[model samples]
Target: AESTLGAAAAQSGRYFGTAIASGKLGDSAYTTIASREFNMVTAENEMKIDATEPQRGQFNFSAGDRVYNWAVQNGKQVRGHTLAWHSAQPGWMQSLSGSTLRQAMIDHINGVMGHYKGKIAQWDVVNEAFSDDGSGGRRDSNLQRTGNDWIEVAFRTARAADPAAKLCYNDYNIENWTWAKTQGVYNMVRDFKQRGVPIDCVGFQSHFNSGSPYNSNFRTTLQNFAALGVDVAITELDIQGASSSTYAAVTNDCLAVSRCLGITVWGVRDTDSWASGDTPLLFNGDGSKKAAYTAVLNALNG
Candidate 1:
């Protein structure tokens, strides 16, 4: 519940990151995000590896580096935004021939991760690899979408490259305990864990809508995942656009979440939160700390 923009904080039972985008770290946003819980995981296009080139042969990390370094030095935590993703890949990465693509995927994982060895606290070793239907689990994303099994390739390579860092399979919509989508995420992660796939945790992108049916189950939902033995991390946390809860309520949510070890709010400060338009977070439209922030603190302090 202890909050700051940094990736690590001593009093912080579990660190939290407000948000990290490729921008001036010296700015209020960067300073605000500097906490033991902070990391550079953002939907920000800046981290999109292919932005540097329109195709696979090129890559870019300049923008994300700024945010990464900010986390490293500020007594905060740093989670590699991602090594590979289906939606954010460059065209060339998606066009490689079979053999070439495999090598490319390996190179991408080793190259990016190699640079941050011992620096990053964790990595979204593999990002969204399954659809809600889980039908695409055929291991086709990299081979088809990006022309590689970069997902598997990244996990193995990342482990070899930095065995100490936490490696996670991150995704969204895992609430409804009985929902097929949630089950799909569970099946994949369970399969990986059983095979000793080198995965350290399952990231729950807890993007909640106040009054949503799943909100009531937040406590049990997290505990159920924790029962899996692997750590459960709240990856992309945000109280989405529609509703606002009182400070007391938000604090209760955080308290419950902190029990999980890693709790990350999608963004910090209402105005700066990415969930602002989609769903405002921890703050109101004007620059005011919503009960959500205080609520999180209460949970952490408890």
Candidate 2:
């Protein structure tokens, strides 16, 4: 009854964070629970390019500022959800091609990262760059389809804007060792280190089906990344099917890996989750802690 998830995680030198839903901030009561349960916060969509800058040469940070400022006021570390991504792109950006498109990306990063410079602790500098097909090839998104060095450029620009923040490459489905996409990500990170890319961490978005058993190589994957001399973190973790089978693997793998920074659940509550139908968070819809909540707390304490 006395356990607090954030305090428990801090004892282990790890952070436990959750994302804020689009409209949940309007309800102070819900926001209070959100800030209290986790030591860090990620604005689910407000920090994306579509939300931060909807028009060319024009930017808006009011929505993202609300999320960051709330985290600052409540004593929580802020992880800027993302600096550049393929989806949720503003209309103006969709028309640019070649160098213009590339410059647009750099300019966007400079603007967003510079605006939130010291206020954020981390940023998913480049997200979902790998193709889901497991081909070790990049996704065909505008960034990748350009067949240029956009990924490297984005990270370099982000580093210039906010030198203090940890820059990470985040992607999903890398938790499963056998998945071809997993190998693609691993090799990419390895190359990044070899090529002297400015990436500091590799974010494994642990989106899983609760019904399926946890991955046997979860710990091994973290070790492999640690060997590359880069930090590893579970960026957007969530397991559906209303089960707690994976929480142990998540926390234990993080504990066993020296470079593992922490785990951030996808959202604060099941009701507001992007996949609400899957009930993919630690808190229930009624604001009560679920079994996964205690499971995560126990994992951290151990």
Candidate 3:
């Protein structure tokens, strides 16, 4: 049997990761399980705009650094959670318009990515830019208002800041090929590739629910994105009320795609999950392994 999820995933040439909320880093039990089981760590909120630069020009890397340093100490890779996103911006950022907003976005990316230039393995350069209505339209946010090329600007800026880190466009509900949202992202990636955009990967936020049926098309979806000449990753995965079989299926799906880099669970334990009242992690509140843990382990080892 594999000694750890990271060990099992490493054997298959992939990583098993989890989001480490810096606040919970103080909990010894949480840190112990996190360090032991995972090979990659993403700052749950520390690296977000609100946490890193809530006051605009004044940057705060204290919280983000904690997560980064912890990951380094634990011998794990780091995935930068995000650089530009509509939801997590501070009040000041939301009020800007036109060129000012654009400059701020650029500066933010440059400052953050520059600060941790060589340490980060990959970054979600832009997050959830598409509307959920399946129209595949851009979200009507301040960034989008600046220009249709805001995403491109962000990706280019990221590449210049840290040329080595993989730049990913991350979103939820893009796992199934049937969804227009999926096609929307696919079309964007294809266009980026043709135009020589700096995109390196596409992130599928595999947030599943117990009631939802298994995504039988998941492996094909990953394969399609990989065919576009960019890697694919399960950026923030959490299955609310999930079964062992569901967890294993997702693991197998990722493994089947050679270009599917890895999977990152959203949180370490059920109690810390953002989806309140939902048990969506592989560990219980007390840090004991859940059946989901074993399921994923067996899948990777198989």
Candidate 4:
């Protein structure tokens, strides 16, 4: 029998990854299963602004550092969850305006990215920057609030901080046929490429629902983005309630596209998931593999 999703992914030149809390340390059941099954791990919340920089000029990367060090010890690659985001920001940031806010943004990127330079495989430079209204416009995030050029500023600053790390723009709701939000991301990234921005990848957070059919053309969405010459990845994937077919569709879709780098489930076990009540993850509450686990393994191996 095929064992270890990451080992199976290696056969296809791809990575199999999962997310977990940074506080989780040592060899518990969760770590045991995670270490044995996956090769890449994304920090669930440790790298967020609220966690890393809770106060102005006071940075705390202890939680995130612990996780990164653990991954290093286990020979697993790590992806920094985010550098710039609309949510999880410190309160002091909300009071700043104009250039002050802009500089703070750049400083945050520099500090965080600098701390993990060359260590992280990738950094989510900006996440969830699109709005939900389908207008294909940037959200009213702190960066946007500072100036129209905030997104560009972010990418440029990230590149300056860690020129070697793959930088990505991550967001959700772009995989479905509803073209509004998805098209917004496409337009923005397309313009970025045209303007010579330094982005390296696009991360599609494929949070799905088991009760509903995949209403979007997963392949087309990835193709459109790949056409811009940037790599594509399914960063945070999960089904609210899952099935074998749900896992198969996403896995097969990524396999069909050469630019799709990898797929990362939101968390190791359902109990560790933010949507735990929905029971959506590769592992069950007790750390046993689920039907989705076998489905993903088969999709990658077959």
Q: Which candidate's lDDT is highest?
A: 3
Q: For residues 81-182, could you state the per-residue lDDT of candidate 3 as single tens digits?
A: 899999899999999999999999999999999899999998999999988876977888999999999999999999999999999999988888888888
What total of clashing residue pairs does each candidate reach? Answer: 32, 0, 0, 2
Return the candidate ranking by lDDT, descending. 3, 4, 2, 1
Using alpha carbons, what is the TM-score of model 3?
A: 0.98
TM-scores of the candidates are 0.80, 0.95, 0.98, 0.96
Pick by lDDT: 3 or 4, better one: 3
- The better candidate by TM-score, 1 or 3, is 3
> lDDT for each of the candidates?
0.61, 0.83, 0.92, 0.85
- Which regions of candidate 3 deviate over 4 angstroms? 210-213
Q: Per-residue lDDT tens digits of candidate 4, residues 1-302?
A: 25889888777888888896865665398889888887888998999988888897789999999888877787689989898888888899877778998888888999899889989888899999988876878898667888778888899999999999999999988887456888888888899999899999999889887533465388888888999999998999888787778888899888888888888889888988889998989898887888988899999998
Model 1 Cα lDDT, one tens digit per residue, 140-230: 5655454434555668888998887888878776765666667766776676667777777777776666543435565566666666667
What local lDDT does model 4 show for residue 219?
84
Q: Please tell me which predicted candidate would have the highest TM-score against the true structure.
A: 3
The 10-residue segment of model 3 with minimum total lDDT is: 207-216
